[PDB]
Amino acid sequence: QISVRGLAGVENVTELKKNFNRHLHFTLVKDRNVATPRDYYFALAHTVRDHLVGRWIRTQQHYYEKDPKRIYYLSLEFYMGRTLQNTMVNLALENACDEATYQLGLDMEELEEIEEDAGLGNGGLGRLAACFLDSMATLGLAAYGYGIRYEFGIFNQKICGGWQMEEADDWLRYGNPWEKARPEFTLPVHFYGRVEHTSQGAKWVDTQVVLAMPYDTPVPGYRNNVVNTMRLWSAKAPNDFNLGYIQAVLDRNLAENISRVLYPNDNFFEGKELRLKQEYFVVAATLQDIIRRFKSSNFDAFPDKVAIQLNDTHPSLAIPELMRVLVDLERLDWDKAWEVTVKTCAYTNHTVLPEALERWPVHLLETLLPRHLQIIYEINQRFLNRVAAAFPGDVDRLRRMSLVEEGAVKRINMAHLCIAGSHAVNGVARIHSEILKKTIFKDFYELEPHKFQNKTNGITPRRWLVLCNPGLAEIIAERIGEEYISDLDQLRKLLSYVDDEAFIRDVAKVKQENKLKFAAYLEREYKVHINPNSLFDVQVKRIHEYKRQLLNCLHVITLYNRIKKEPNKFVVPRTVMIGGKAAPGYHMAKMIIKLITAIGDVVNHDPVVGDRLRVIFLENYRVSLAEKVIPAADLSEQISTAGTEASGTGNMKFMLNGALTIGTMDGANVEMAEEAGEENFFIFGMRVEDVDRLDQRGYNAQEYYDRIPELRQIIEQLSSGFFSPKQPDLFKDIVNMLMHHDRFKVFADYEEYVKCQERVSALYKNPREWTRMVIRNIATSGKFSSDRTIAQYAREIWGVEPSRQRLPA
Amino acid sequence: QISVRGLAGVENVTELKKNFNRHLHFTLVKDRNVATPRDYYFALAHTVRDHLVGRWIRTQQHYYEKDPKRIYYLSLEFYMGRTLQNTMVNLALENACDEATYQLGLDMEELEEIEEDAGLGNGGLGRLAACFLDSMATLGLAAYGYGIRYEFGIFNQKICGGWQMEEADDWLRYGNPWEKARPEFTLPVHFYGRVEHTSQGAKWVDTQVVLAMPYDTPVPGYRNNVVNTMRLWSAKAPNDFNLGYIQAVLDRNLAENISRVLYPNDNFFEGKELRLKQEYFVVAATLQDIIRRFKSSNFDAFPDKVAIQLNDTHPSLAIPELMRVLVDLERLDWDKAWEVTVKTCAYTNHTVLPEALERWPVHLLETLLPRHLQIIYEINQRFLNRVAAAFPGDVDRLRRMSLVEEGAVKRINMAHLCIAGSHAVNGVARIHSEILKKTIFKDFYELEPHKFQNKTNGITPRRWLVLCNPGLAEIIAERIGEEYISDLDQLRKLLSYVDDEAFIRDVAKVKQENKLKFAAYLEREYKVHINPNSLFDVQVKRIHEYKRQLLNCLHVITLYNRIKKEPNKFVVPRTVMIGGKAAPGYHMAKMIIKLITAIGDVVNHDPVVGDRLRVIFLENYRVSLAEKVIPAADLSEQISTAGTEASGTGNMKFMLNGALTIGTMDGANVEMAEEAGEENFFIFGMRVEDVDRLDQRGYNAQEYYDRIPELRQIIEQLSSGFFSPKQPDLFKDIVNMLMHHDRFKVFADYEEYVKCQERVSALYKNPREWTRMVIRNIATSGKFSSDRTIAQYAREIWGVEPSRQRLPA
Ligand SMILES: OC[C@H]1O[C@@H](NC(=S)N/N=C/c2ccccc2Cl)[C@H](O)[C@@H](O)[C@@H]1O
Ligand SMILES: OC[C@H]1O[C@@H](NC(=S)N/N=C/c2ccccc2Cl)[C@H](O)[C@@H](O)[C@@H]1O
Ligand SMILES: OC[C@H]1O[C@@H](NC(=S)N/N=C/c2ccccc2Cl)[C@H](O)[C@@H](O)[C@@H]1O
Ligand SMILES: OC[C@H]1O[C@@H](NC(=S)N/N=C/c2ccccc2Cl)[C@H](O)[C@@H](O)[C@@H]1O
């Protein structure tokens, strides 16, 4: 029906129908009489996956023949979402499958809704890994994603009485048609034990063994016939494990628990042994796999054939593990091993919040990984010798830069380990990378300035435009062709349409259709009703104090109080939508969810308000939900305290899909405003420098409370029980935090935020001018393609050239 | 190459090759460059399983249309072995697949060796269930096998220093191509909780829920296009289970442990809570499935449409569970519910050893299954009221017959429950069924004589002749056609060939070839060497004192001592093979294994013995090993103390495959001798009556030691450390048991056994007469087909007619 979804040729449609019926019969063992809708989904998934096979085999044999430098992207998170539509998109099969299923009497969109998200990540860091895999395949790089196959991904969030409840995400229950188990590449991973010193080197002995079994998932490039691999490890007990008899068999669970569940903390470090085991498990298995592949091509050439990218410090044990293998097993001298390690590894930092940095207690590494601790001590000694020689007599520099932190419990600073052992260190947006050089890692930058880079984040325009917003993709393609899908900078061509009345109409129409579709989704699957003519004001992202969902809450209550004060004045109607999961042990984030729903309970049932203001909490925010809500949004809320959000990627998704942004000058927001023009962005609030100034003289929230009467009213409503009549003191913790211990200065940005929101309402009253500003945002979103990001990693870090050329079909 | 393996037509061979290549590519994602031998096995398994699909769908739709009475065979064990060859045999595909793989450059037999046994049983009881499924499908009955899908089956046995070591049988590691998960028929099973009484009935509340997920495995009939289902339940935690967060997810293992591992006790009861949970789990899920299927056809008609066969007392909770559903959920009155239950259920007993009978402590049922305990008390009260009315004043009868056993701990006698709640009770061989009426269940037989039946055990001639011994099957088919494969009584026709010189030669030749093949197997995969001209003397079965592997050991040492006494006399050379697993907690059985290997260590390295006597312990005896060794055997050792082996089925396998039998008049041995003629069987030892007489006056082993000098020598060799020079007292427990507490009267049968063994050696010196006696055994083995057994269950218990007619192809 629409052009960018590909051809529906008669031979292809006929073949798809035939293969669908074959899988339903021979694979699922069903006929049309008994087949459940889930069966039809699986028949389609098997039909589509068949098309990946030849390309997957020939891609991997091509890398074997050509032997290019291989890129290994190590991450504890890969937030993939659904795979069916994405695979159709990248193979140009969407229209053909739509037609084939139509002719079989089935609605493809309904079948798509049956697929479980692969929710193997928490938020931005996990989703970045996923966008990256897509871009690496689209750019023809010999790339492999390596991670853990968690049996349970991020929990499903249910809201009960306004409170978050967690349930297990049993995503493999029905089986995963997108993975192939590879038991023949099963590898042993070692834990505990002790170090023995002999005449010729150290030996790690008396270890416990866990097996690492790999599962391969295809990663198709966009219409280039490239299919790369994401290899995820699953933990298996050896067969002689604990081998009264019954108990020994049941105890296999202890070993297999390593790959059981994703830790649900976003930007927070928890020093739990099971998490450390997960980190080593992925690193040990991956490195053996890498080395095995390299030998099937002398370690001088290792860095010419291997790049390892560490996604934050979670896989930081790769550094001492590589040293361990090179020194203990291969018998290289320390200095040569070290040279190889440094040239091989690169590190990407994703946060500056101190509570998020990994600092592992020494006693934990001592017991679990005794040889790695010894290697880390040796790395530290040699590194600090270099610091002492460069900055003679600077004894405080020595303690600041040490990988070993002194105190009550001695800890290892994993970020310091990553910097010492990597040839490149990057932040994820220009302002974040600057903050790294100026504050957090200032000492390291002074020692080795050449190591520090920026690589501004991006998103894939395949999932985040073509897949989720075909209507917008189509009206764009009608004017500029479809080359922009893998060359997003071409969207600049749309600037010459900003005065085109047909395009203005079409852009506004597509947004309207998306909003109608989302309004319908809400009624059908949540029995909740909304006005589709209102401004859709959306903040979706994990719940964190730094992200300031609370600031948004204050604005919502402000609008409610103004309406109640002057009921008969006109206000631009809004649907305010907030969604996101809270980490299970994060009390304040759970209280914020409760506040949001409690505000909704008052606002949504006030007769005087009518349909002028609605507050909805979007339950179970995840990749599939984002694909629905982002295309429907008018206003994107990106309101973190300046200096706290390293980049953001949600911001970029909204920009690409025709929402305007209200935001602080934080993370990639700065670069977004710079690309679009500050006139085309709703910027408010303290800059980083303003935050610094306030910290110096001291942040007194009371001052704001005292001079802003509208703010005072809200605090008094919260305190007195206006939003919780049966438990009047319910929100006391929130009020006390705001008044006395707010690290994120919510009150300080309140006035500017409200005034900026008034300017948004003003522009939305003028549909034509709203839409022209939207066009200027979409047209300048090109920089934020992860294809650009990956091309920069490739050229400036990995030392490889991207290729847009297609492999034989 | 051989006729009974079917046709290798040009179209079929071409199609198989094509589909093999398709699965290797599209299913396994491999090409011929990287494909492992395991990959080739899977490609073949998928190619063969494709042929089951249409037949499986049409069989099940046929049962839906015709609505015949359904047979539900409930067992905690299904000892299936490998599935690939069996499926080819039953579909007539063996020659075609042999040819197709040959043309692809592959050896099919080598691919067959890659398949894991489905080892979901311990021994005879589990293997009986498997033979039964085959016969039910071959006889066109609407039958379903229901059990548990254990993640770990019977342990793999390794012998280390002559001692048994157990390792986990991780049989699902590579995935099982013969099962289809059916998540849409997932059912809840309830545990713990409490009983609440209301105005209208009892209610079972506050329960913990475990989910039962079914996996279906096809059971093909022999060339009749019937494909029945074996449905095995797997335990799954609900998603809100235990729902700090991490621990709650890891604790799901506690619920899922129910289906983790098969209890490895053969003929021994262990009152462990996990075992009780397994028994209820299979019963609760199965009964809901049965009832659901019945409603998709008023409970008066229930027994006309449903038969439930209880394989021993392990699924005895079906009786109170059916009552529970009928009374509590469907609101039938007690007496009507009871009538339905009794007419529906039948019970098969498999043992008379008191330590094997299930007697569950009341306190365990009280906590785990409070409502079932109440129902059991009520059943008992009403039953004992009937006993009191039939035998007024007989107060000891009342205590003897009670389902509740008094004592230190009150227990429930599950066998008494089964008798009370079933319309039929059967033993598994004529002598065993007689023993049930005369001793163990005498009181019950006097109350309800009509309930008691015999159904002599059988084995399937598909697996146990055609599959494992194609050479023998072929020379038979050459003379009498191939109808005997599903009508085994036709083997009587072979009696007119007992004087045929060509047939005599062919029978002897096939045995020789089988022995050469097995001698080669032993060298290749165990580096052990044997003389293929020797008499192959085989005892394979689980290790138990009652089975008297120890009596066999005494004979072996006797032969060794005689050789050493007169080294230069001629003796018929023997290879004595003993194999079987010991239950992990059964100390004496583990000591017997150690004795066997210790005897081998002395005998096999004595230069004076040469190749005249060899003693081999066959490691890891299981269904696949039985298929190899049974066709190779000359002498079958079936030497249990009279009255202890209920039937035996191993005995029948050897008879069908051309071994002669040395045995006591125990279990089915009696009926075997009766069929073949006592002159054609090597019978020795006490009859049941002789055992009874000895028990009355008291068994004194010392008497035998005192008057048999050859026996005295052996005991002195054992005691003094002749067979364990470094640990002279190693076998003290064995000697003390033999001398002072032998329940199985090993010494009492010693003299007769040795003399009978001399007669065996004498006949083996005359090849022509040995073979004529073999022909007389094979020719009269027809009675022992499980087709006969199942036809009797069908007509005399289930009330259904078997059909040899084929369904549309
Ligand atoms: O269907 C569920 C099972 O599927 C198996 N996949 C098999 S057999 N082939 N996959 C082929 C494949 C896989 C991915 C992409 C393309 C193809 Cl063409 C996985 O190994 C199991 O771990 C999983 O449980
Ligand atoms: O670069 C991608 C995105 O990365 C995010 N970081 C995240 S989700 N870290 N999770 C860290 C984490 C995850 C799990 C466990 C412990 C921790 Cl400590 C940043 O906050 C975003 O500003 C940025 O856009
Ligand atoms: O390959 C391993 C996986 O296979 C799956 N089987 C599928 S998809 N089809 N089976 C079809 C089938 C099954 C049996 C007989 C004939 C056919 Cl035609 C099982 O449901 C999984 O539990 C198992 O792990
Ligand atoms: O009828 C088939 C065969 O049944 C065997 N019984 C067996 S394996 N019981 N296992 C009982 C068992 C099994 C598991 C756990 C506890 C127990 Cl208590 C008989 O000993 C044979 O003489 C007979 O041929």
Inter-residue contact A708 to A750 (CB < 8 Å)? yes
Question: Which residues neighbour B251 within 8 Å (Cβ) at sequence distance 6 or greater?
Answer: B241, B242
Determine whether the interchain pair A272/B246 forms a contact, defined as Cβ–Cβ distance below 8 Å.
yes
Check residue A785 and report its DSSP letter. B
CB contacts < 8 A (A, B): 103
Q: What angle do CA B26, B28, B31 make, to 5 degrees?
A: 80
**Strand ordering across the sheet containing B359-361:** B359-361, B411-413, B404-405
Instruction: Enumerate helices (H) and strands (E) in chain B, giving the number of each.
Output: 34, 25
The residue among B255, B309, B305, B301 whose CA lies nearest residue B277 is: B255
Residue A451 and residue A467 in one domain: no
- Identify whether residues A235 and A356 lie together within a single domain: yes
Largest Cα–Cα distance in chain A? 90
Number of domains in chain B: 2
Instruction: For B407-416, give one letter per residue: b (16+ CB within 10 A) or e.
Output: eeeebbbbbb
Phi, psi of B150, deg, nearest 5? -75, 135
DSSP E strand stretches across A371-439: 404-405, 411-413, 424-427
Element (H, E) at A72: strand A70-74
Residues B439 and B493 in one domain: no
Tell me the C-alpha distance between B108 and B470, whole Å: 15
Whether residue B261 and residue A250 make contact (CB cut-off 8 A), yes or no, is yes
- Whether B541 is a known active-site residue: answer yes
Tally Cβ neighbours within 10 Å of residue A412: 25
CA distance A640 to A550: 10
| CB atoms closer than 10 angstroms to residue A475 | 18
Map residue B436 onto helix, strand or coil. helix
DSSP for B347-380, written as a single string: EE-----GGGS-EEEHHHHHHH-HHHHHHHHHHH
Three-state DSSP state, B282:
helix
- Of all ligands present, the nearest one to the C-alpha of B76 is 4
Please name which ligand lies nearest the alpha carbon of A586: 2
Token couple for B750: 């010693």
Residue the block writes with tokens 């103390």: B641
Q: Going by C-beta distance under 8 Å and a sequence separation of 6 or more, which residues neighbour residue B589?
A: B543, B544, B545, B582, B583
Considering Cα of B374, then B375, then B380, then B381, what sign does the dihedral take? positive
Asked if B277 is an active-site residue, the reply is: no
Locate tokens 């703010």: which residue? A711
| CA atoms of B141 and B221, how far apart (whole Å) | 10
H helical segments located in B404-447: 414-420, 430-435, 442-447
Contact A57 B236 (CB under 8 A): no
Q: Is A263 in the pocket of ligand 2 (CB under 6 A)?
A: yes
Cα dihedral across residues B602, B605, B608, B614: positive or negative: positive
For A555, the domain range is 459-785
Residues B276 and B409 in one domain: yes
Contact predicate B462/B222, CB 8 Å: yes
HSE value, Cβ hemisphere, 13 Å, CA-based, for A37? 10
Minimum-distance ligand 2 atom for the alpha carbon of A348: 1
Residues in contact with A476: Cβ distance below 8 Å, sequence separation at least 6, in sequence order: A484, A491, A494, A778
3-state secondary structure of B680: helix
Query: Could you tell me if B756 and B791 lie in one domain?
Result: no
Q: Are residues A565 and A440 in the same domain?
A: no
Tokens standing for A750?
């309140």
> Quick one: tokens of A670?
């700065």
| The token pair that represents A467 in the structure block | 């897949």
Task: Give SS3 for A484.
Answer: helix
Residue A349 CA to ligand 2 center (angstroms) comes to 9
H/E run at residue B129 = helix B124-138
Residues B385, B389, B390, B395: is their CA dihedral positive or negative?
positive
B92 touches B331 (CB < 8 A): no
Domain match, B416 and B473 both: no
Phi/psi of residue A467, each to 5°? -65, -50
DSSP one-letter string for A248-260: HHHTHHHHHGGGT
Phi, psi of A120 (to 5 degrees): -90, 40
Q: Which atom of ligand 3 is least distant from the CA of B53?
A: 18
Residue B366 CA, distance from chain mean position: 32
CB contact under 8 Å between A246 and B274, yes or no, is yes
The answer to whether residues B793 and B781 belong to one domain is: no
Cα-based angle B730, B734, B738 (whole degrees, multiple of 5) = 150
Residue B734 backbone zone (phi > 0: left; psi -120 to 50: alpha; other: beta)? alpha
Domain shared by B138 and B287, yes or no:
yes
Burial (CB < 10 A; 0-12, 13-18, 19+), residue B1, is exposed
Neighbour tally for A400: CB within 10 Å: 14
Taking CA atoms only, the protein residue closest to ligand 2 atom 7 is A125
Are residues B443 and B574 part of one domain? no
Chain B residues within an 8 Å CB radius of A156: 239
- Alpha-carbon distance of B236 to B232, in angstroms, equals 13
Q: How far is CA A199 from CA A196, A205, A206, A378, in A?
A: 10, 16, 19, 19
**Going along A95-186, which residue ranges are E strands?**
118-120, 143-148, 156-160, 163-167, 180-181
How far is residue A141's CA from residue A135's CA, in Å, rounded to a whole number? 9
**B422 and B510, same domain (yes or no):** no
> CB–CB of A357/A441 below 8 Å?
no
As a whole number of angstroms, the distance between CA A594 and CA A601 comes to 10
Ligand nearest, relative to CA of residue B154: 4
- Whether the CB-CB separation of B358 and B316 falls below 8 Å is answered with yes
Tell me which method was used to determine the 3D structure: X-ray
The residue type found at B219 is V
Amino acid of residue A409: V
CA B349/CA B125 separation, integer angstroms: 10
| Diameter over CA atoms, chain B | 90
Where are the extended beta strands (E) located within B452-516? Answer: 452-454
Bridge partners for B361 per DSSP: B411
Q: For residue B136, what is the enclosing H or E element?
A: helix B124-138
Helix A94-103 to helix A10-22 angle (10° resolution) is: 60
Contact A239 B38 (CB under 8 A): no
Interface test with B, best of A29, A65, A266 (most B CBs within 10 A): A29
Could you tell me if A92 and A4 are in contact, meaning their C-beta atoms sit under 8 angstroms apart? no
CB A776 within 8 A of CB A677: yes
CA distances from B265 to A239, A346, B465 (A): 20, 56, 29
After which residues is the backbone of chain B broken at C–N > 2.5 Å?
243, 297
Residue with tokens 């979901």: B120
For A29: left if phi > 0, alpha if psi spans -120 to 50, otherwise beta; the answer is left
| Run of H or E residues at B337 | helix B334-344
The whole-angstrom separation of Cα A337 and Cα A334 is 5
- Which tokens sit at B656? 């069908």
Q: Give, as one character, the DSSP assignment of residue A492.
A: G
Q: Using CA atoms of B562, B563, B564, B565 in order, give the dihedral in degrees to the nearest 10.
A: 50
Q: What is the dihedral of CA A100, A106, A109, A114, to 10 degrees?
A: -120
Residue B499 DSSP label: T
Query: Do A406 and A647 contact (CB within 8 A), yes or no?
Result: no
Q: Which structure tokens are listed for A229?
A: 């691999």
Listing DSSP states for A516-584 in one string gives: HHHHHHHHHHH-----TTSEEEEEES---TTTTHHHHHHHHHHHHHHHHHSTTS----EEEEEE-PPPT
Nearest CB to A57: which of B31, B54, B257?
B31
Residues B274 and B277: their CA atoms lie apart, in Å, by: 5
Strands (E), B525-649: 535-540, 574-579, 613-618, 635-638
Residues in chain B: 809
Both A433 and A495 in one domain: the answer is: no
Instruction: Tokens for A270, please give them.
Output: 């928890």
Concatenated DSSP letters of A214-279:
EEEEEEE-SSS--EEEEEEEEEE--TTTT--HHHHHHTHHHHHGGGTB----SS-----HHHHHHH
Amino acid identity for residue B203 in this structure: K
Amino acid at the residue A749: D
| Six token digits for residue A715 | 């605090």
- When CB atoms are compared, the residue of B156, B165, B584 closest to A244 is B584
Q: Which of A381, A425, A386, A436 is nearest to A404 (CA)?
A: A381
For residue A95, the tally of other CB atoms under 10 A from its CB is: 20
B369: CATH: 3.40.50.2000
β pairing state of B70-74 and B143-148: parallel
Instruction: Return the closest-CA partner of residue B149 out of B88, B236, B221.
Output: B236
